[PDB]
CSV table of N, CA, C and O (backbone and C1' of nucleotides) and ligand atoms in Angstrom, one decimal:
chain,number,residue,atom,x,y,z
A,454,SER,N,-19.8,6.4,-2.3
A,454,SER,CA,-18.9,7.3,-1.7
A,454,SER,C,-19.0,7.3,-0.1
A,454,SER,O,-18.8,8.4,0.5
A,455,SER,N,-19.2,6.2,0.4
A,455,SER,CA,-19.1,6.0,1.9
A,455,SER,C,-19.0,4.5,2.2
A,455,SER,O,-20.0,3.7,2.0
A,456,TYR,N,-17.8,4.0,2.6
A,456,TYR,CA,-17.5,2.6,2.7
A,456,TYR,C,-16.6,2.4,3.9
A,456,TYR,O,-15.7,3.1,4.1
A,457,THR,N,-16.9,1.4,4.7
A,457,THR,CA,-16.0,1.0,5.7
A,457,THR,C,-15.8,-0.5,5.5
A,457,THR,O,-16.8,-1.3,5.4
A,458,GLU,N,-14.6,-0.9,5.5
A,458,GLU,CA,-14.1,-2.2,5.2
A,458,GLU,C,-14.6,-3.1,6.4
A,458,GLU,O,-14.4,-2.7,7.6
A,459,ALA,N,-15.1,-4.3,6.1
A,459,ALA,CA,-15.5,-5.1,7.2
A,459,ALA,C,-14.7,-6.4,7.3
A,459,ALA,O,-14.5,-6.9,8.5
A,460,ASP,N,-14.2,-6.9,6.2
A,460,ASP,CA,-13.4,-8.1,6.1
A,460,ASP,C,-12.3,-8.2,7.1
A,460,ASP,O,-11.3,-7.6,6.9
A,461,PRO,N,-12.4,-9.1,8.1
A,461,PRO,CA,-11.4,-9.1,9.2
A,461,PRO,C,-10.1,-9.5,8.7
A,461,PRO,O,-9.1,-8.9,9.1
A,462,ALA,N,-10.1,-10.4,7.7
A,462,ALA,CA,-8.9,-10.7,6.9
A,462,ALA,C,-8.2,-9.4,6.4
A,462,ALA,O,-7.1,-9.2,6.8
A,463,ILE,N,-8.9,-8.6,5.6
A,463,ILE,CA,-8.3,-7.4,5.1
A,463,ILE,C,-7.9,-6.4,6.2
A,463,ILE,O,-6.8,-5.9,6.2
A,464,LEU,N,-8.7,-6.3,7.3
A,464,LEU,CA,-8.3,-5.4,8.4
A,464,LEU,C,-7.1,-5.8,9.2
A,464,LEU,O,-6.3,-5.0,9.6
A,465,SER,N,-6.9,-7.1,9.4
A,465,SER,CA,-5.8,-7.6,10.1
A,465,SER,C,-4.5,-7.4,9.2
A,465,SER,O,-3.6,-6.7,9.7
A,466,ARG,N,-4.5,-7.9,8.0
A,466,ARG,CA,-3.4,-7.7,7.1
A,466,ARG,C,-3.0,-6.2,7.1
A,466,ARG,O,-1.8,-5.9,7.3
A,467,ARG,N,-4.0,-5.4,6.9
A,467,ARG,CA,-3.7,-3.9,6.9
A,467,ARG,C,-3.3,-3.4,8.3
A,467,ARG,O,-2.4,-2.5,8.3
A,468,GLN,N,-3.8,-4.0,9.4
A,468,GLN,CA,-3.3,-3.5,10.6
A,468,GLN,C,-1.9,-3.8,10.8
A,468,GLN,O,-1.1,-3.0,11.2
A,469,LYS,N,-1.5,-5.1,10.4
A,469,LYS,CA,-0.2,-5.6,10.5
A,469,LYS,C,0.8,-4.6,9.8
A,469,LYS,O,1.7,-4.1,10.5
A,470,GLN,N,0.5,-4.3,8.6
A,470,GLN,CA,1.3,-3.4,7.8
A,470,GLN,C,1.5,-2.1,8.5
A,470,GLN,O,2.6,-1.5,8.5
A,471,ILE,N,0.5,-1.6,9.1
A,471,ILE,CA,0.5,-0.4,9.9
A,471,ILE,C,1.4,-0.5,11.1
A,471,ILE,O,2.2,0.3,11.4
A,472,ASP,N,1.1,-1.6,11.8
A,472,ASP,CA,1.8,-1.8,13.1
A,472,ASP,C,3.3,-1.9,12.8
A,472,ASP,O,4.1,-1.4,13.6
A,473,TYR,N,3.7,-2.5,11.7
A,473,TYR,CA,5.0,-2.6,11.3
A,473,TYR,C,5.6,-1.1,11.3
A,473,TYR,O,6.6,-0.9,11.8
A,474,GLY,N,4.8,-0.3,10.6
A,474,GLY,CA,5.3,1.1,10.4
A,474,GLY,C,5.5,1.9,11.7
A,474,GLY,O,6.3,2.8,11.8
A,475,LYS,N,4.6,1.6,12.7
A,475,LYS,CA,4.7,2.3,13.9
A,475,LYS,C,5.8,1.8,14.7
A,475,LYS,O,6.4,2.6,15.6
A,476,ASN,N,6.2,0.6,14.5
A,476,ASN,CA,7.3,0.0,15.3
A,476,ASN,C,8.7,0.5,14.9
A,476,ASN,O,9.7,0.2,15.5
A,477,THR,N,8.7,1.2,13.8
A,477,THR,CA,10.0,1.8,13.4
A,477,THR,C,10.3,3.0,14.3
A,477,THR,O,9.5,3.4,15.1
A,478,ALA,N,11.6,3.4,14.3
A,478,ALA,CA,12.1,4.5,15.1
A,478,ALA,C,11.7,5.8,14.5
A,478,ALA,O,11.5,6.8,15.2
A,479,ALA,N,11.5,5.9,13.2
A,479,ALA,CA,11.1,7.1,12.5
A,479,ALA,C,9.7,7.5,13.0
A,479,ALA,O,9.5,8.7,13.2
A,480,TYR,N,8.8,6.6,13.1
A,480,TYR,CA,7.5,6.9,13.6
A,480,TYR,C,7.6,7.3,15.1
A,480,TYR,O,6.8,8.2,15.5
A,481,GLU,N,8.4,6.6,15.9
A,481,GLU,CA,8.6,7.0,17.3
A,481,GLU,C,9.1,8.4,17.2
A,481,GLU,O,8.5,9.3,17.9
A,482,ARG,N,10.1,8.7,16.5
A,482,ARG,CA,10.6,10.1,16.3
A,482,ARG,C,9.6,10.9,15.4
A,482,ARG,O,10.0,11.4,14.3
A,483,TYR,N,8.4,10.9,15.8
A,483,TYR,CA,7.4,11.7,15.1
A,483,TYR,C,6.4,12.1,16.2
A,483,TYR,O,5.2,12.0,16.1
A,484,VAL,N,7.1,12.4,17.3
A,484,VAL,CA,6.4,13.0,18.5
A,484,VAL,C,6.5,14.5,18.2
A,484,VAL,O,6.1,15.3,19.0
A,485,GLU,N,7.2,14.8,17.1
A,485,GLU,CA,7.3,16.2,16.7
A,485,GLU,C,6.3,16.7,15.7
A,485,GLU,O,6.7,17.3,14.7
A,486,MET,N,5.0,16.4,15.8
A,486,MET,CA,4.0,16.8,14.9
A,486,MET,C,2.6,16.8,15.5
A,486,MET,O,2.0,15.8,15.8
A,487,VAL,N,2.0,18.0,15.6
A,487,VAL,CA,0.6,18.1,16.0
A,487,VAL,C,-0.4,17.9,14.9
A,487,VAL,O,-0.3,18.6,13.9
A,488,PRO,N,-1.4,17.0,15.1
A,488,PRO,CA,-2.5,17.0,14.2
A,488,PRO,C,-3.3,18.3,14.3
A,488,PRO,O,-2.9,19.4,13.8
A,489,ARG,N,-0.3,16.3,10.8
A,489,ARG,CA,-0.7,17.7,10.5
A,489,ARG,C,-1.2,17.8,9.0
A,489,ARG,O,-2.4,17.6,8.8
A,490,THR,N,-0.4,18.1,8.1
A,490,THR,CA,-0.8,18.2,6.7
A,490,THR,C,-0.7,16.9,5.9
A,490,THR,O,-0.6,15.8,6.5
A,491,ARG,N,-0.9,17.0,4.6
A,491,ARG,CA,-0.8,15.8,3.7
A,491,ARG,C,0.6,15.7,3.1
A,491,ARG,O,0.9,14.7,2.5
A,492,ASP,N,1.4,16.7,3.3
A,492,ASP,CA,2.8,16.7,2.9
A,492,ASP,C,3.5,15.8,3.9
A,492,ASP,O,4.6,15.3,3.7
A,493,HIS,N,2.9,15.6,5.1
A,493,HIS,CA,3.4,14.7,6.1
A,493,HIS,C,3.2,13.3,5.7
A,493,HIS,O,2.5,13.0,4.7
A,494,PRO,N,3.7,12.3,6.5
A,494,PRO,CA,3.4,10.9,6.2
A,494,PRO,C,2.3,10.4,7.1
A,494,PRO,O,2.5,10.3,8.3
A,495,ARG,N,1.1,10.2,6.6
A,495,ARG,CA,0.0,9.8,7.4
A,495,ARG,C,-0.4,8.3,7.0
A,495,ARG,O,-0.4,7.9,5.9
A,496,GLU,N,-0.7,7.5,8.1
A,496,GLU,CA,-1.0,6.1,7.9
A,496,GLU,C,-2.2,6.0,7.1
A,496,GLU,O,-3.2,6.8,7.2
A,497,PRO,N,-2.3,5.1,6.1
A,497,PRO,CA,-3.5,4.9,5.3
A,497,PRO,C,-4.7,4.6,6.2
A,497,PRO,O,-4.5,4.0,7.3
A,498,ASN,N,-5.9,5.0,5.7
A,498,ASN,CA,-7.1,4.6,6.4
A,498,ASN,C,-7.2,3.1,6.2
A,498,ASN,O,-7.3,2.6,5.0
A,499,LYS,N,-7.3,2.3,7.2
A,499,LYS,CA,-7.3,0.9,7.0
A,499,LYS,C,-8.7,0.5,6.6
A,499,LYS,O,-9.0,-0.6,6.0
A,500,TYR,N,-9.7,1.4,6.9
A,500,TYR,CA,-11.1,1.1,6.7
A,500,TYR,C,-11.5,1.6,5.3
A,500,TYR,O,-12.7,1.4,4.9
A,501,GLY,N,-10.6,2.2,4.6
A,501,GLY,CA,-11.0,2.7,3.3
A,501,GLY,C,-11.2,1.7,2.3
A,501,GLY,O,-10.7,0.6,2.4
A,502,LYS,N,-12.1,1.9,1.3
A,502,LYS,CA,-12.3,1.0,0.2
A,502,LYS,C,-11.1,1.3,-0.7
A,502,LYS,O,-11.0,2.3,-1.3
A,503,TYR,N,-10.3,0.2,-0.8
A,503,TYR,CA,-9.1,0.3,-1.6
A,503,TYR,C,-8.8,-1.0,-2.3
A,503,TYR,O,-9.2,-2.0,-1.8
A,504,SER,N,-8.2,-0.9,-3.4
A,504,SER,CA,-7.8,-2.2,-4.1
A,504,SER,C,-6.5,-2.7,-3.4
A,504,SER,O,-6.0,-2.0,-2.5
A,505,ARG,N,-6.1,-3.9,-3.7
A,505,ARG,CA,-5.0,-4.5,-3.0
A,505,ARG,C,-3.7,-3.8,-3.3
A,505,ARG,O,-2.9,-3.4,-2.4
A,506,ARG,N,-3.5,-3.5,-4.6
A,506,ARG,CA,-2.3,-2.7,-5.0
A,506,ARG,C,-2.3,-1.3,-4.4
A,506,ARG,O,-1.3,-0.8,-4.0
A,507,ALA,N,-3.5,-0.8,-4.4
A,507,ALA,CA,-3.7,0.6,-4.0
A,507,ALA,C,-3.3,0.8,-2.6
A,507,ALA,O,-2.6,1.8,-2.3
A,508,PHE,N,-3.7,-0.1,-1.7
A,508,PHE,CA,-3.4,0.1,-0.3
A,508,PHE,C,-2.0,-0.2,-0.1
A,508,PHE,O,-1.3,0.4,0.8
A,509,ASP,N,-1.5,-1.2,-0.8
A,509,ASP,CA,-0.1,-1.6,-0.6
A,509,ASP,C,0.8,-0.4,-1.1
A,509,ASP,O,1.6,0.0,-0.5
A,510,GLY,N,0.4,0.1,-2.3
A,510,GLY,CA,1.0,1.3,-2.9
A,510,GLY,C,1.2,2.4,-1.9
A,510,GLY,O,2.3,3.0,-1.7
A,511,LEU,N,0.1,2.7,-1.2
A,511,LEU,CA,0.1,3.8,-0.2
A,511,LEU,C,1.0,3.5,1.0
A,511,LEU,O,1.7,4.4,1.5
A,512,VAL,N,1.0,2.2,1.4
A,512,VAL,CA,1.8,1.8,2.5
A,512,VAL,C,3.3,1.9,2.2
A,512,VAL,O,4.1,2.4,3.1
A,513,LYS,N,3.7,1.4,1.0
A,513,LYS,CA,5.1,1.6,0.6
A,513,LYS,C,5.5,3.0,0.8
A,513,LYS,O,6.5,3.3,1.5
A,514,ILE,N,4.7,3.9,0.2
A,514,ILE,CA,5.0,5.3,0.2
A,514,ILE,C,5.0,5.9,1.6
A,514,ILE,O,5.7,6.8,1.9
A,515,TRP,N,4.2,5.2,2.4
A,515,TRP,CA,4.1,5.7,3.8
A,515,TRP,C,5.5,5.4,4.5
A,515,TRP,O,6.1,6.4,5.0
A,516,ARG,N,5.9,4.2,4.5
A,516,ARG,CA,7.2,3.8,5.1
A,516,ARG,C,8.4,4.6,4.6
A,516,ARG,O,9.2,5.0,5.4
A,517,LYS,N,8.4,4.8,3.3
A,517,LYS,CA,9.5,5.6,2.7
A,517,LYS,C,9.5,7.0,3.3
A,517,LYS,O,10.5,7.4,3.8
A,518,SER,N,8.4,7.6,3.2
A,518,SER,CA,8.2,9.0,3.7
A,518,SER,C,8.6,9.1,5.2
A,518,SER,O,9.1,10.1,5.6
A,519,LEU,N,8.4,8.0,5.9
A,519,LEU,CA,8.8,8.1,7.3
A,519,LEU,C,10.2,8.4,7.5
A,519,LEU,O,10.6,9.2,8.4
A,520,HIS,N,11.1,7.9,6.7
A,520,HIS,CA,12.5,7.9,6.9
A,520,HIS,C,13.1,9.3,6.9
A,520,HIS,O,14.3,9.4,7.3
A,521,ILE,N,12.3,10.3,6.6
A,521,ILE,CA,12.8,11.7,6.7
A,521,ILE,C,12.9,12.0,8.2
A,521,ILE,O,13.2,13.1,8.5
A,522,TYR,N,12.6,11.1,9.0
A,522,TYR,CA,12.5,11.3,10.5
A,522,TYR,C,13.5,10.7,11.4
A,522,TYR,O,13.2,10.3,12.5
A,523,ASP,N,14.8,10.6,10.9
A,523,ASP,CA,15.9,10.4,11.8
A,523,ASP,C,17.3,10.4,11.2
A,523,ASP,O,17.4,9.8,10.1
A,524,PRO,N,18.3,11.1,11.8
A,524,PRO,CA,19.7,11.0,11.4
A,524,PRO,C,20.5,10.0,12.2
A,524,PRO,O,21.6,10.3,12.7
B,1340,G,O5',-21.7,10.8,-1.8
B,1340,G,C5',-22.8,10.7,-2.8
B,1340,G,C4',-22.7,11.8,-3.8
B,1340,G,C3',-21.5,11.9,-4.6
B,1340,G,O3',-21.4,10.9,-5.7
B,1340,G,C1',-22.0,14.0,-3.8
B,1341,G,P,-20.0,10.5,-6.3
B,1341,G,O5',-19.2,11.9,-6.6
B,1341,G,C5',-19.5,12.6,-7.8
B,1341,G,C4',-18.7,13.9,-7.7
B,1341,G,C3',-17.2,13.8,-7.9
B,1341,G,O3',-16.8,13.6,-9.2
B,1341,G,C1',-17.7,15.3,-6.1
B,1342,C,P,-15.5,12.7,-9.5
B,1342,C,O5',-14.3,13.5,-9.0
B,1342,C,C5',-14.1,14.8,-9.5
B,1342,C,C4',-13.0,15.5,-8.8
B,1342,C,C3',-11.7,14.8,-8.6
B,1342,C,O3',-10.9,14.7,-9.8
B,1342,C,C1',-12.2,15.9,-6.6
B,1343,C,P,-9.9,13.4,-10.0
B,1343,C,O5',-8.8,13.6,-8.8
B,1343,C,C5',-7.9,14.7,-8.9
B,1343,C,C4',-7.1,14.8,-7.6
B,1343,C,C3',-6.1,13.7,-7.2
B,1343,C,O3',-4.9,13.8,-8.0
B,1343,C,C1',-7.3,14.4,-5.3
B,1344,A,P,-4.2,12.4,-8.4
B,1344,A,O5',-3.5,11.9,-7.1
B,1344,A,C5',-2.5,12.7,-6.5
B,1344,A,C4',-2.1,12.2,-5.1
B,1344,A,C3',-1.8,10.7,-5.0
B,1344,A,O3',-0.4,10.4,-5.4
B,1344,A,C1',-3.3,11.3,-3.3
B,1345,A,P,-0.2,9.5,-6.6
B,1345,A,O5',-0.5,8.0,-6.1
B,1345,A,C5',0.2,7.5,-5.0
B,1345,A,C4',-0.4,6.3,-4.4
B,1345,A,C3',-0.8,5.2,-5.5
B,1345,A,O3',0.3,4.4,-5.9
B,1345,A,C1',-2.6,5.6,-4.1
B,1346,A,P,0.5,4.0,-7.4
B,1346,A,O5',-0.7,3.0,-7.7
B,1346,A,C5',-0.8,1.8,-7.0
B,1346,A,C4',-2.2,1.2,-7.1
B,1346,A,C3',-2.7,0.9,-8.5
B,1346,A,O3',-2.2,-0.3,-9.0
B,1346,A,C1',-4.3,2.2,-7.4
B,1347,G,P,-1.2,-0.4,-10.3
B,1347,G,O5',-2.0,-1.1,-11.4
B,1347,G,C5',-3.2,-0.5,-11.9
B,1347,G,C4',-4.2,-1.5,-12.4
B,1347,G,C3',-4.7,-2.6,-11.4
B,1347,G,O3',-5.8,-2.2,-10.8
B,1347,G,C1',-3.8,-3.7,-13.4
B,1348,G,P,-6.1,-2.6,-9.3
B,1348,G,O5',-6.5,-4.1,-9.4
B,1348,G,C5',-7.7,-4.5,-10.0
B,1348,G,C4',-8.1,-5.9,-9.8
B,1348,G,C3',-7.7,-6.5,-8.4
B,1348,G,O3',-8.7,-6.2,-7.4
B,1348,G,C1',-6.9,-7.9,-10.1
B,1349,C,P,-8.2,-6.2,-5.9
B,1349,C,O5',-8.2,-7.8,-5.7
B,1349,C,C5',-7.3,-8.3,-4.7
B,1349,C,C4',-7.0,-9.7,-5.0
B,1349,C,C3',-6.0,-10.4,-4.0
B,1349,C,O3',-6.7,-10.8,-2.9
B,1349,C,C1',-5.3,-10.7,-6.2
B,1350,C,P,-6.2,-10.4,-1.5
B,1350,C,O5',-4.8,-11.3,-1.4
B,1350,C,C5',-4.9,-12.7,-1.6
B,1350,C,C4',-3.6,-13.4,-1.7
B,1350,C,C3',-2.5,-13.0,-0.7
B,1350,C,O3',-2.7,-13.5,0.6
B,1350,C,C1',-1.5,-13.3,-2.9
B,1351,C,P,-2.0,-12.7,1.8
B,1351,C,O5',-0.5,-13.3,1.8
B,1351,C,C5',-0.2,-14.7,1.8
B,1351,C,C4',1.3,-15.0,1.8
B,1351,C,C3',2.1,-14.2,2.8
B,1351,C,O3',2.1,-14.7,4.1
B,1351,C,C1',3.2,-14.2,0.7
B,1352,U,P,2.3,-13.7,5.3
B,1352,U,O5',3.8,-13.4,5.4
B,1352,U,C5',4.8,-14.4,5.3
B,1352,U,C4',6.2,-13.8,5.1
B,1352,U,C3',6.6,-12.7,6.0
B,1352,U,O3',6.9,-13.2,7.3
B,1352,U,C1',7.2,-12.2,3.8
B,1353,U,P,6.3,-12.5,8.6
B,1353,U,O5',7.1,-11.2,8.8
B,1353,U,C5',8.5,-11.2,9.0
B,1353,U,C4',9.2,-10.2,8.2
B,1353,U,C3',10.7,-10.1,8.5
B,1353,U,O3',11.3,-9.7,7.2
B,1353,U,C1',9.7,-8.0,9.0
B,1354,U,P,11.9,-10.9,6.3
B,1354,U,O5',13.0,-10.2,5.5
B,1354,U,C5',14.0,-9.4,6.2
B,1354,U,C4',14.9,-8.6,5.3
B,1354,U,C3',14.2,-7.4,4.6
B,1354,U,O3',15.1,-6.4,4.5
B,1354,U,C1',15.2,-8.9,3.0
B,1355,U,P,15.3,-5.3,5.7
B,1355,U,O5',14.0,-4.5,5.6
B,1355,U,C5',13.7,-3.7,4.5
B,1355,U,C4',12.4,-3.0,4.6
B,1355,U,C3',12.0,-2.5,6.0
B,1355,U,O3',11.5,-1.2,6.0
B,1355,U,C1',10.3,-3.9,5.2
B,1356,C,P,12.5,0.0,6.2
B,1356,C,O5',12.3,0.9,4.9
B,1356,C,C5',11.4,0.5,3.9
B,1356,C,C4',11.5,1.4,2.7
B,1356,C,C3',12.4,0.9,1.6
B,1356,C,O3',11.9,1.4,0.3
B,1356,C,C1',13.2,3.0,2.3
B,1357,A,P,11.5,0.3,-0.8
B,1357,A,O5',12.3,-1.0,-0.3
B,1357,A,C5',13.6,-1.3,-0.6
B,1357,A,C4',13.9,-2.7,-0.2
B,1357,A,C3',13.3,-3.7,-1.1
B,1357,A,O3',14.1,-4.0,-2.2
B,1357,A,C1',12.8,-4.3,1.1
B,1358,G,P,13.5,-4.7,-3.5
B,1358,G,O5',13.3,-6.2,-3.1
B,1358,G,C5',14.5,-7.0,-2.8
B,1358,G,C4',14.0,-8.4,-2.5
B,1358,G,C3',13.0,-8.9,-3.5
B,1358,G,O3',13.6,-9.4,-4.7
B,1358,G,C1',12.2,-9.3,-1.4
B,1359,G,P,12.8,-9.4,-6.0
B,1359,G,O5',11.6,-10.4,-5.8
B,1359,G,C5',11.9,-11.8,-5.8
B,1359,G,C4',10.8,-12.6,-5.2
B,1359,G,C3',9.6,-12.9,-6.0
B,1359,G,O3',9.8,-13.9,-7.0
B,1359,G,C1',8.9,-12.4,-3.9
B,1360,G,P,9.0,-13.8,-8.4
B,1360,G,O5',7.7,-14.6,-8.2
B,1360,G,C5',7.7,-15.8,-7.4
B,1360,G,C4',6.3,-16.2,-7.1
B,1360,G,C3',5.3,-16.1,-8.2
B,1360,G,O3',5.4,-17.2,-9.1
B,1360,G,C1',4.4,-15.2,-6.2
B,1361,C,P,4.9,-17.0,-10.6
B,1361,C,O5',3.3,-17.0,-10.5
B,1361,C,C5',2.6,-18.2,-10.2
B,1361,C,C4',1.2,-17.9,-10.3
B,1361,C,C3',0.7,-17.3,-11.5
B,1361,C,O3',0.5,-18.2,-12.6
B,1361,C,C1',-0.3,-16.2,-9.7
B,1362,C,P,0.7,-17.8,-14.1
B,1362,C,O5',-0.5,-16.8,-14.4
B,1362,C,C5',-1.9,-17.3,-14.4
B,1362,C,C4',-2.9,-16.2,-14.4
B,1362,C,C3',-2.8,-15.2,-15.5
B,1362,C,O3',-3.3,-15.6,-16.7
B,1362,C,C1',-3.1,-14.0,-13.4
B,1363,A,P,-2.6,-15.1,-18.1
B,1363,A,O5',-3.1,-13.6,-18.2
B,1363,A,C5',-4.5,-13.3,-18.1
B,1363,A,C4',-4.7,-11.8,-17.9
B,1363,A,C3',-4.1,-10.9,-18.9
B,1363,A,O3',-4.8,-10.9,-20.1
B,1363,A,C1',-3.8,-10.1,-16.7
B,1364,C,P,-4.0,-10.6,-21.5
B,1364,C,O5',-3.5,-9.1,-21.3
B,1364,C,C5',-4.3,-8.0,-21.5
B,1364,C,C4',-3.7,-6.7,-21.2
B,1364,C,C3',-2.6,-6.2,-22.1
B,1364,C,O3',-3.1,-5.6,-23.3
B,1364,C,C1',-1.9,-5.9,-19.9
B,1365,C,P,-2.4,-5.7,-24.6
B,1365,C,O5',-0.8,-5.3,-24.3
B,1365,C,C5',-0.4,-4.0,-24.3
B,1365,C,C4',1.1,-3.8,-24.0
B,1365,C,C3',2.0,-4.3,-25.1
B,1365,C,O3',2.1,-3.5,-26.2
B,1365,C,C1',2.8,-5.0,-23.0
B,1366,C,P,1.9,-4.0,-27.7
B,1366,C,O5',3.4,-4.1,-28.3
B,1366,C,C5',4.5,-3.5,-27.6
B,1366,C,C4',5.7,-4.5,-27.6
B,1366,C,C3',5.7,-5.5,-28.7
B,1366,C,O3',6.2,-5.0,-29.9
B,1366,C,C1',6.1,-6.6,-26.6
B,1367,C,P,5.6,-5.6,-31.3
B,1367,C,O5',4.9,-7.0,-30.8
B,1367,C,C5',3.4,-7.2,-30.8
B,1367,C,C4',3.0,-8.4,-29.9
B,1367,C,C3',3.7,-9.7,-30.1
B,1367,C,O3',4.9,-9.8,-29.5
B,1367,C,C1',1.3,-10.0,-30.0
C,575,CA,CA1,-1.7,8.6,-9.6
C,576,CA,CA1,1.2,2.1,-11.7
C,577,CA,CA1,3.4,-4.9,-13.9
RNA sequence: GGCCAAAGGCCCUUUUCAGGGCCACCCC
């Protein structure tokens, strides 16, 4: 119950997926939230012990959730 | 420590609110 991912391979791939998400306009238009809840869209911990599907699963849900953030 | 979200095990891509691959489970 305490793990930090070391594999540079895994961390890059995961960073990329995250970087993608921040590069969206929805994330830009998320200057309207003070660190908040879990009902919000929070980027997955890249350092978390996660399975491949698990992390990808989270990321999918992350990006979708983002889209609540622009008309 | 535990519990939850996510999660079949991995793998590719800016088709990325997305598309795909291998294996496994299923239906034998
Ligand atoms: Ca679940
Ligand atoms: Ca599932
Ligand atoms: Ca399946």
